Structure formats: structure tokens, C-alpha cells
Write a protein that binds this ligand. Structure first.
Ligand code: DUP
Ligand code: CL
Ligand code: CL
Ligand code: MG
Ligand code: NA
Ligand code: NA
Length: 307
DNA sequence: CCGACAGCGCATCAGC
DNA sequence: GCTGATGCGC
DNA sequence: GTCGG
């Protein structure tokens, strides 16, 4: 909020690079710069000042100078009024429509949500669902609803087989007051490093909790769910992970992104699967893990895992 | 100067 | 029909 | 776009 003008500018630049220019690394550069500035506890008076922050270089410092002196960015104002670029950028807000699809659509005169509605045959299954729940997917989920959603998931999972273990991770596990989606990690003692995932998904569809499917395989389900009453439709992912790699998965999918990076950087090598020792760099076999604390013993409650 | 910049499952396409 | 590449979300 | 070897 203290430098919201600058961070919004950088975020807008970020999106354009990712969505229109298809330059993912420049997207991430702008985001990294936006993040380090948003955490900066002073009102920025110059680009030179911001330049001192890691992730802010010459080009962004120059842009900040323009923004501070004029209250805007010339090229950013031009991009906003550009029909092609703004349409491409907007279409990517539809889940399933990335930079490639967005560009192709705009190339053939398809630029709006209404245009998408008139051209259903040109959309794949995922994109049709993204279109259908466009507004709902951009809503956040209050913790109270997440709790009700957790109630349903844990209940139905245990009814299928009481030996399943299910954990809602992500921001919810970190105790966030709101969440963007629901991330569920699933395991079963019969699965280590059968159709375990299918049976869970089917039961959730049976009680009319899961309403649509974006993608589904033996280890990962991505779909849509809805609380009964009208509640917005929500995004839910369910991952089946081997029992012996469960808690590494729980750690990884709990977050936050900043905490995860800082944890393995201050670590051994830690990925989503295992933790293995490193010698000349030759990684050994995975270490035995039966809890989150074991990783730390090689502690931070989820409540404080922002960094 | 110049390469890194995370890594994975699934859906779908390109090539054969 | 197949294998591998690409797009996509996250 | 920025960083760092
Ligand atoms: O690009 C990504 C994003 C997330 N992840 C993992 C790490 C993260 O902790 C986990 C949860 O992703 P969310 O984007 O769902 N993080 P959070 O769930 O904590 O934010 P929200 O409440 O917005 O989902 O998925 C990746 O591996 N790659
Ligand atoms: Cl790039
Ligand atoms: Cl591994
Ligand atoms: Mg989440
Ligand atoms: Na800097
Ligand atoms: Na999209």
C-alpha cells in the first residue's frame, strides 16, 4: 500500500510480458521487483533508492523515475489502449486460455467473453469450464467456507476407506482468513514409492460436491466444487502421493512460496518428494520421513510460514 | 558477455 | 495407431 | 529484466 502505485505498475508490466510478449522470465523479474518493493517499509522517492533492492535494476529504476515525475508510464498507457494487446491479456484470465490460445483467438477476431460464448466449438473442455465459471474463479474463499469444504472432503474420504489420509494444505493450512482455492493431499498405506484417486473423486461427485473436471489422472485431479445450499463454484485439486513421500509433499504444498525457497536454501536438498543428503555433491538415498518435524530435525508451525 | 531464471501431471497437438 | 513436444496451471 | 559467474 505504501508504494502501491509502483507495485501495480510493475504487476501490470509483468502480466503484459507473460500474456502478450510471452516472456516468462521478464514476467517473473517484474513480479520479483514488485514483491521486494511491496515489502519495503518506506515511501520510495527515487528509482536510485529502489535500485538498492535486490531484483530492481536499471530499467525498473528508470521506470520508477518516470512514474514518480509524471504519475504514469507512457508505454503502459499505450499498451492499455491497444485493442490487440489488452484483449490478449484479458482472455488469459480464463482458466485454460494461456498466451498461445489468447493470441490465436484474438488473431481471428475473438476478443471478449461474449465472443468466447459465441464460439464454444473452438474451446477445449478446460476452457469451456473456465468460461462457465469465469467470475466465480476470480472470487476468493472465506475461511468459514473452506472449513465447510474441509468437512465434506474429510468425511467423504473416510467413508470410501478409513485408512486414507487427507490433508488440506496451501494457505488454508497456514491459517489464512481467505483462500484462492482448495489444495488436498491424499495418501493410502497401499500406495508407496490401484485406483485410489478415482474412488475418492467419484464419491465426491456422488454427494454432488465436485461438479466439474478440468483434468484427471491416477495421481492428480483438478476440478470444480461447490458447497450445497447459492455458493460460488470453487477450484479444488487433489493429489495422490506415496505414503513414504507424504509429509515432504505436505510441507511443499503448504507454502508459502517464500518460506519454501528459504527453507531449502537454508538446507541437504529438499524437493516435493524427498529429502536427501549431499562429499562432492553426490546425492544419497532419500531419508526416512514420517512427519513434518523430521524435515526440521534434519520447527515452524504453518501459521508462521510466510517466510 | 551470456546463461539461469522450478518443476510436475495431464490434455492435446505435431510428427511419423 | 504410436511417441514426443507443447500448452497450461500452479 | 536482473543477477552473477
Ligand atoms: O506455480 C506454482 C504454485 C504453487 N505451487 C505449490 C507450492 C504452493 O505452496 C502450493 C499451493 O499453491 P497455491 O497457489 O494454491 N498457494 P496458496 O494455496 O498458499 O495461495 P491461495 O490461497 O492463493 O491458493 O502449490 C507450485 O509448485 N508451483
Ligand atoms: Cl523471457
Ligand atoms: Cl527424489
Ligand atoms: Mg491454494
Ligand atoms: Na538492485
Ligand atoms: Na488462463
Amino acid at each position: 500500500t505504501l508504494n502501491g502505485g509502483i507495485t501495480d505498475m510493475l504487476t501490470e508490466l509483468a502480466n503484459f510480458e507473460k500474456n502478450v510478449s510471452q516472456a516468462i522470465h521478464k514476467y517473473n523479474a517484474y513480479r520479483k521487483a514488485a514483491s521486494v518493493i511491496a515489502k519495503y517499509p518506506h515511501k520510495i522517492k527515487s528509482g536510485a533508492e529502489a535500485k538498492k533492492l535486490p531484483g530492481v535494476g536499471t530499467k525498473i529504476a528508470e521506470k520508477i523515475d518516470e512514474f514518480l515525475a509524471t504519475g504514469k508510464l507512457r508505454k503502459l498507457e499505450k499498451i492499455r489502449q491497444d485493442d490487440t494487446s489488452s484483449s490478449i491479456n484479458f482472455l488469459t484470465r480464463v482458466s485454460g486460455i494461456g498466451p498461445s490460445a489468447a493470441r490465436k483467438f484474438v488473431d481471428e477476431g475473438i476478443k471478449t467473453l461474449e465472443d468466447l460464448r459465441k464460439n464454444e466449438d473452438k474451446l477445449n473442455h478446460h476452457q469451456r469450464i473456465g468460461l462457465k465459471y469465469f467470475g466465480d474463479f476470480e472470487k476468493r474463499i472465506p475461511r468459514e467456507e473452506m472449513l465447510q469444504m474441509q468437512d465434506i472432503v474429510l468425511n467423504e474420504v473416510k467413508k470410501v476407506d478409513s485408512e486414507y489420509i487427507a490433508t488440506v494444505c496451501g494457505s488454508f493450512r497456514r491459517g489464512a482468513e481467505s483462500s484462492g482455492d482448495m489444495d488436498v493431499l491424499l495418501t493410502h498405506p497401499s500406495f508407496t514409492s490401484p485406483k485410489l484417486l478415482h474412488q475418492v473423486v467419484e464419491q465426491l461427485q456422488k454427494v454432488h460436491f465436485i461438479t466439474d473436471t478440468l483434468s484427471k489422472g491416477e495421481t492428480k485431479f483438478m476440478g470444480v466444487c461447490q458447497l450445497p445450499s447459492e455458493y460460488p463454484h470453487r477450484r479444488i485439486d487433489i493429489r495422490l502421493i506415496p505414503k513414504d513421500q507424504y509429509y515432504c509433499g505436505v510441507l511443499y504444498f503448504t507454502g508459502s512460496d517464500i518460506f519454501n525457497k528459504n527453507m531449502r536454501a537454508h538446507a541437504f536438498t529438499i524437493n516435493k518428494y524427498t529429502i536427501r543428503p549431499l562429499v562432492t555433491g553426490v546425492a544419497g538415498e532419500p531419508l526416512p520421513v514420517d512427519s513434518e518435524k523430521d524435515i526440521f530435525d534434519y520447527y515452524r508451525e504453518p501459521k508462521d510460514r510466510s517466510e
